[PDB]
Amino acid sequence: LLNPKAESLRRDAALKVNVTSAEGLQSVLETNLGPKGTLKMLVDGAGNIKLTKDGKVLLTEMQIQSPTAVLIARAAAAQDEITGDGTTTVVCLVGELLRQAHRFIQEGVHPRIITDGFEIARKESMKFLDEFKISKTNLSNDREFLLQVARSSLLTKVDADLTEVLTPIVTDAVLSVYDAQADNLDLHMVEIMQMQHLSPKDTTFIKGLVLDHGGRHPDMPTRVKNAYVLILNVSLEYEKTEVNSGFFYSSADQRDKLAASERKFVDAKLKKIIDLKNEVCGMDPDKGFVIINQKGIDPMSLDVFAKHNILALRRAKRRNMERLQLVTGGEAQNSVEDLSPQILGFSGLVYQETIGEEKFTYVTENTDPKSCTILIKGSTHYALAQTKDAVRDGLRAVANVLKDKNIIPGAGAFYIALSRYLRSANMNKLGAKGKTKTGIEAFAEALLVIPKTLVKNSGFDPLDVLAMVEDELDDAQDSDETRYVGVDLNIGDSCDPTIEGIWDSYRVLRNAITGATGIASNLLLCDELLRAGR
Amino acid sequence: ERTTGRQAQISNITAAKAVADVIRTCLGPKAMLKMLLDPMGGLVLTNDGHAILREIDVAHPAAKSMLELSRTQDEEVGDGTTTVIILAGEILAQCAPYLIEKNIHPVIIIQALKKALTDALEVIKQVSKPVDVENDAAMKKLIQASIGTKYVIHWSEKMCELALDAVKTVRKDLGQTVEGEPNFEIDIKRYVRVEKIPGGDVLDSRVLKGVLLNKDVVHPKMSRHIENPRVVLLDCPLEYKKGESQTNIEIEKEEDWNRILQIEEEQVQLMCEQILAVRPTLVITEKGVSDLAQHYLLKGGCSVLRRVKKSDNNRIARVTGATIVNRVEDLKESDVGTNCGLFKVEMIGDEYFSFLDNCKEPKACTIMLRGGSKDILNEIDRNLQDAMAVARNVMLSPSLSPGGGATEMAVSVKLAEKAKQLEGIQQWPYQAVADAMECIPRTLIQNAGGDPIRLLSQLRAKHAQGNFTTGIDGDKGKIVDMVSYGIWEPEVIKQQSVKTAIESACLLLRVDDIVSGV
């Protein structure tokens, strides 16, 4: 049963390849899990080395011919768009679930019964999912609990020293953008900017917006406190005639007169701008005037604006002009003829942080900015790439906490309890089927991979901690009270995940159990592999 | 180059056996998934039998004949694509030892397959049970078989109404000893052609009898509906005509300039006057309409439609009877606009439409579908064709046959009984047909996980002593009666299944050599 230029793997031989295909992808990603995970290198082929612990960036940068890992990577990409966290968690659940299933495949169990046992246990897992979850209050004074959610998304990908740096940055970034009510939150209002020349531990949060081009003149004020803002669209630099012409000077001084006469049209608008500062808080302290003007400005106007102590910006990004319009409040002024003091906005202290090569102007201390900025600092591109992965996944982690009022404790508390749940429930219930008991038991034993590999990457004996946690759960059930138990990676014993502050999102775990079950199910449904047309 | 002797008979059976062997796991609602490896880095997880074999490149030409066999089955029945291919491939596999090891001449086997085909059609008619085709509640539970496990399961009641009301419009059910019996002819292809309108709800989807047009009315104030309409169809636009020869009008005299400008407006009115001679209430043209022709026909008391496709007017001519006449002076009085109920221009989804809908069924209809998106309309579309294909097989024969391996085993038992009473050398290949009929239910057992040998012999014992309605359950996988949970499918599916299977099997057995040349 063959034709030329074809390959076929049939009669359970495809199952041994597909399960091994999952064991190969699992062992690679088994190294990095939780805060004890590992760092990997990704070569794009252009010579740029990128170090990241995020499974989202890993699966996209690597090319795998194995079709089993392709479906895992494609399904994890859907999980990365929905959950945004726990990419490795999904892979570890799929691989181990196929390993426990492959042992029953060698026993002669049909894969449909194995997949049916996973779907029945998944429906019972969703019932325990709603029972085990903890309902968190909607109060926005919960920052203490947000400090626990932050450490969950931070400690994983960082040395834990950048955690204390990024903890006040991420937590203040979400609550500043989020108004107090139930409405929504916008992650686009938080800008992510990267800079060099300074250590990553000095990364700071920017309440306002950050920009590159500053006022160029030695005498311009560096620090201006509580100044009015002007958004100006008109070019203050030298202009030329729209039609071809020339300047013919009879005398040497006439050459400067013709140049001053052409700039007089721009100088006429320049006089109307400086009269606005003389009209409003010219000599008044704690008040100033700033020119964010979008188009270019010649050095002659920069010298005039410096004598007035006016900060003058030129060649500003078009997107930032609309963003600074909402942050500062001042409307965009196309023509100076319509310039009025009521159009001017208001901002707080504007101070230029000037390194050797570059100058940084800060818009911060705004009345109603409604836009934040996270400025990522690093000496090399390694710290800039690793921090950007922690910021993007850190903001989306807290974002799912305000959108979903339900939260679940982490540290394997959900996986160990549910595995013990299906073990004791299926024996008491016995309402599924006799042959389904294999699929249910394999699914319950496969979910132990996360708490086993989490402490395995920590170095502690997994058999010891899983025994102490199981004994503590049995002692908790004998005392007849609710006790949440989780693994402690630093000490190696058990602990309380609610006290330790380790929490897992509800939407992440809801799509992880349902997603990993659907991934491994479709892989067991493949009896034969076929390669044709090649 | 050349395959002679018995080598060609081996390659013809092996090629058909390889195509069937791939989709053996594709049979049943519990059927497994097939992972295909493309020459590129892609993969295909689809379990649909037609989408798999289409992505599988084949070499031997007999495998291409099996691909064309499934293409014919897809035009007849909407489901059961793998059922016919596996059955046709197993017949050649069961006749392989008798053709070679037993040294039976192939023509003897081919003549034996024709006798087994006639006996099989008689057994299917005996095991089939009648059902009321006029019961609306019964037809919904039938079509529902091709409905569930799809997104349309929630609207299934509305999906059956759109399926029944569509086929009941185009069907002509007649019979007698005088002019003959059409045998309940139903054409889904040409007459039931559908138009999908985005937006709205499935409840708002209606089956209109007529031709639907997306173009609006040229003037806002006009007669919305006419009692007894008169329709004129013409391809030519409405505007000032010009001569085909050289036309030059030289104006010298002063008072003759305004006269020619009036004649140009009279020529436009003259072309409209030739249309109004038959007193039409509706004017449909393929090209645009000039503003002058709009005003001349507005005062004439008729409806005007412009920018209508030519393929649409051809479908209008069949439900109406108005023949397209190019020149307005050649307009016949024989073609009329009769049997057109309403001209209603009512806006649907912020887009002005035109309704030709009538109160009668001129053997055609236009289905108007509403959905939440174009992907939903495409899902409703293909599901509506499969919904009507099941209702078609029920209207093309009153009897239903049990599925899930019940009919497959019911035939194999009767073939084994007729084998003992059939003398001659054709008896041995005749028993191979009954062994091929047992492959379909055993395939459902292999996909279920149960013991294929144990459950098959026990299932055969149920047909021998008890009734034939005891099949294999899809969800469970244990021997049960099909009367409990009806899997029941129409007989027409089983008719063409074994019919084309023998025709495709005998076609490959007749070829004793394969040569290459142009």
Query: Any CB–CB contact under 8 A between A531 and chain B?
Result: yes
Q: Are B232 and B283 in contact (CB under 8 A)?
A: yes
Question: Which helix (H) or strand (E) element contains residue B508?
Answer: helix B491-509
Cα–Cα distance measured from residue B401 to residue B487, given in angstroms and rounded to the nearest whole number: 9
Dihedral of CA atoms B80, B85, B87, B92 in degrees, nearest 10, equals 170
Torsion, Cα of B14, B19, B21, B23 (10° steps): -170
Map residue A405 onto helix, strand or coil: coil
| Separation of alpha carbons A388 and A385, rounded Å | 5
Separation between Cα atoms, residue A449 and residue B330, nearest integer Å: 85
- Residue ranges of alpha helices (H) inside A369-448 are 381-403, 413-429, 436-446
CB A79 within 8 Å of CB A60: no
Q: Are residues A72 and A113 in the same domain?
A: yes
Asked if A278 and A177 sit in the same domain, the reply is no
**Number of other residues whose CB lies within 10 A of the CB of residue B388:** 25
Between strands B282-285 and B231-234, the pairing is parallel
Instruction: Choose among A507, A498, A511: nearest CA to A399.
Output: A507
Of B14, B30, B57, the CB nearest to A112: B30
B285, containing H or E segment: strand B282-285
Alpha carbons B416 and B421: distance in angstroms, whole number: 9
Best mutation site among B12, B22, B35 for testing chain A: the one with the most A CBs within 10 Å? B35
The residues in A 71-90 lying below 8 A from B, measured between CB atoms, are: 71
Q: Are residues A214 and A326 in the same domain?
A: yes
Q: Distance (Å, rounded) from C-alpha A384 to C-alpha A199?
A: 10
Partner-chain residue, chosen from A1, A14, A522, that has the shortest CB–CB distance to B21: A1
CB contact under 8 A, B57 and A6: yes
Q: In sequence order, what are the beta bridge partners of A135?
A: A406
Owning domain of residue A203: 137-207+370-405
How many CB atoms are located within 10 Å of the residue A517 CB?
22
Q: Which residue in B15, B32, B43 is closest to A525 by CB distance?
A: B32
Q: How far apart are CA A22 and CA A20, in angstroms?
A: 5
Which member of B21, B22, B33 has the closest CB to residue A522? Answer: B33
Q: How many CB atoms lie within 10 A of CB B326?
A: 10
Contact assessment for residue B379 and residue B389, using Cβ atoms and an 8 Å cutoff: no
**Chain A residues closer than 8 Å to B33 by CB:** 522, 525-526
Is the CB of A5 inside 8 Å of chain B's CB atoms?
yes
State both tokens at A375. Answer: 């400025």
In the three-class reduction of DSSP (H, G, I as helix; E, B as strand; rest coil), residue B279 is classed as coil
Cβ burial, residue A433 (10 Å; 0-12/13-18/19+) = middle
Across the interface, whether the CB atoms of B37 and A70 are under 8 A apart is answered no
Q: Find tokens 């807290």 and name the residue.
A: A398
Nearest Cα to Cα of residue A193 among A377, A11, A65: A377
Q: CB–CB of B35 and A533 under 8 A?
A: no
| Ramachandran angles phi, psi of B186, nearest 5° | -135, 130
Put simply, the answer to whether A109 touches B449 (Cβ < 8 Å) is yes
> Does A4 lie at the interface with B, CB-CB under 8 angstroms?
yes
In Å, how far is A7's CA from the nearest CA of chain B?
9
Q: How many other CB atoms sit within 10 Å of the CB of residue B351?
A: 11
Count up the domains in chain A and report the number.
Answer: 3
CATH assignment at residue A377: 3.30.260.10
Helix (H) or strand (E) segment spanning residue B87: helix B81-94
User: CB-based contact (8 Å) between A45 and chain B?
Assistant: no
Is the Cβ pair B57, A7 closer than 8 Å? Answer: no
Helices B136-147 & B374-395 angle (0-180, nearest 10): 120
Q: Please indicate whether, in this complex, the C-beta atoms of B448 and A112 are within 8 angstroms of each other.
A: yes
A9 touches chain B (CB under 8 A): no
Yes or no, beta carbons of A1 and B60 under 8 Å apart: no
The SS3 assignment for B110 reads: helix
Which residues lie below 8 Å from residue A108, measured CB to CB, with a gap of 6+?
Answer: none
For residue B56, list chain A residues with Cβ-Cβ distance below 8 A: 530, 532-533
The token pair at B425 is 């050398």
Q: Please give the angle made by the CA atoms of A377, A381 and A385, to the nearest 5 degrees.
A: 75
- Report the C-alpha gap between A236 and A243 in whole angstroms: 20
State whether residue B515 sits within 8 Å of chain A by CB. no
Minimal C-alpha gap between A182 and chain B (Å)? 29
- Is some CB atom of chain B closer than 8 A to the CB atom of A283? no
Residues A243, A338, single domain; the answer is yes
Residue A530 distance to chain B (closest CA, Å): 5
Question: Contact, B511 vs B12, CB < 8 A?
Answer: yes
**Is residue B10 within 8 angstroms of chain A, CB to CB?**
no
Q: Is B399 exposed, middle or buried (0-12, 13-18, 19+ CB in 10 A)?
A: middle
Q: Are strands A345-347 and A350-354 parallel, antiparallel or unpaired?
A: unpaired
**Do A446 and A331 have their domain in common?**
no
Inspect the interface and report whether the beta carbons of B18 and A529 lie closer than 8 Å: no
- Residue B172 CB: number of other CB atoms within 10 A? 11
CB–CB contact B34 A526 (8 Å) = yes
CB B452 within 8 A of CB B442: yes
> What distance in Å separates residue B1's CA from the closest CA in chain A?
15
- Do A213 and A347 lie in one domain? The reply is yes
Q: Which residue of B lies nearest to A10 if distances are taken between CA atoms?
A: B22
Which residue in chain A has the smallest CA separation from B39? A534
Active site residues of B: 48, 81-82, 386
Q: Do A530 and B41 touch (CB under 8 A)?
A: no
DSSP one-letter code for B150: S
Report CB contact under 8 Å: B37, A534. Answer: yes
Any idea what the Cα angle at residue A450 is, between residues A449 and A456, rounded to 5°?
A: 85
Whether residue A318 contacts residue A294, with contact meaning beta carbons closer than 8 Å, is answered with: yes
What residues of chain A lie within 8 A of the CB of B22, using their CB? 528, 530
Token pair belonging to B208? 């209109």
Of B15, B32, B43, the CB nearest to A70: B43
Residue of B nearest to A530 (CA): B36
Contact status of B518 with chain A (Cβ, < 8 Å): no
Distance from CA of B386 to the nearest CA of A (A): 26
* Tally of CA atoms within 13 A in the half-sphere of B60 that contains its CB: 22
The residues, any chain, with a CB within 8 Å of residue B318's CB and separated by 6 or more, are B362, B364
Q: A290: which strand partners?
A: A229, A311
Query: Which has the closest alpha carbon to B316: B237, B209, B169, B211?
Result: B211
Q: CB within 8 A of A119, min separation 6: which ones?
A: A517, A521
Q: Which residues of A touch B37 (CB under 8 A)?
A: 7, 67, 529-532, 534
Q: Are B22 and A67 an interchain contact pair (Cβ–Cβ within 8 Å)?
A: no
Of B22, B35, B449, the CB nearest to A526: B35
Quote the CA–CA distance of B451 and B445 in Å, as a whole number: 7
B343 lies in which domain range?
A: 210-357
Whole-angstrom Cα distance, residue B172 to residue A471?
76
Of A63, A67, A527, the CB nearest to B32: A527
* A113, A221: one domain: no
Query: Which DSSP string do the residues of A112-174 spell out, in sequence order?
Result: HHHHHHHHHHHHHHHHHHHHH-EEPP--TTTHHHHHHHHHHHHTTTS-SHHHHHHHHHHHHHH
Check if the beta carbon of residue A14 is closer than 8 Å to that of residue A527.
Answer: yes
Residues 216-275 (A) with a CB less than 8 A from some CB of B = none
Q: Which residue of A has its CA nearest to B15?
A: A1
Answer yes or no: do A411 and A455 share one domain.
yes
Q: How many CB atoms lie within 10 A of CB A368?
A: 11
Beta pairing class for A494-495 and A486-487? antiparallel
Q: How far, in Å, CA of A114 to CA of B242, rounded? A: 79
Q: Please answer yes or no on whether A3 and B60 come within 8 Å at the CB atom.
A: yes
* Binary contact (B447, A532; C-beta < 8 A): no
> Residue B234: which CATH number?
3.50.7.10
Contact B34/A at CB under 8 A = yes
Dihedral sign computed on CA atoms, order A10, A11, A15, A17? negative
Closest CA to A496 of A420, A404, A418, A412: A412
* Chain A 441-500, residues with CB within 8 Å of chain B CB atoms: none
Sheet containing B33-37: give its strands across: A7-9, A526-531, B33-37, B43-44
Q: A525 vs B56: CB contact, 8 Å cut-off?
A: no
**How many CB pairs below 8 Å do chains A and B form together?**
76
Query: How close is the nearest chain B Cα to the Cα of A29, in Å?
Result: 22
* Strand-pair category, B470-472 with B479-481: antiparallel
Q: Which of A153, A96, A33, A56 is nearest to A505 (CA)?
A: A153
In chain B, residues with a C-beta closer than 8 Å to the C-beta of A532 are 36-37, 55-58
Give the DSSP H or E segment for A252: helix A252-279
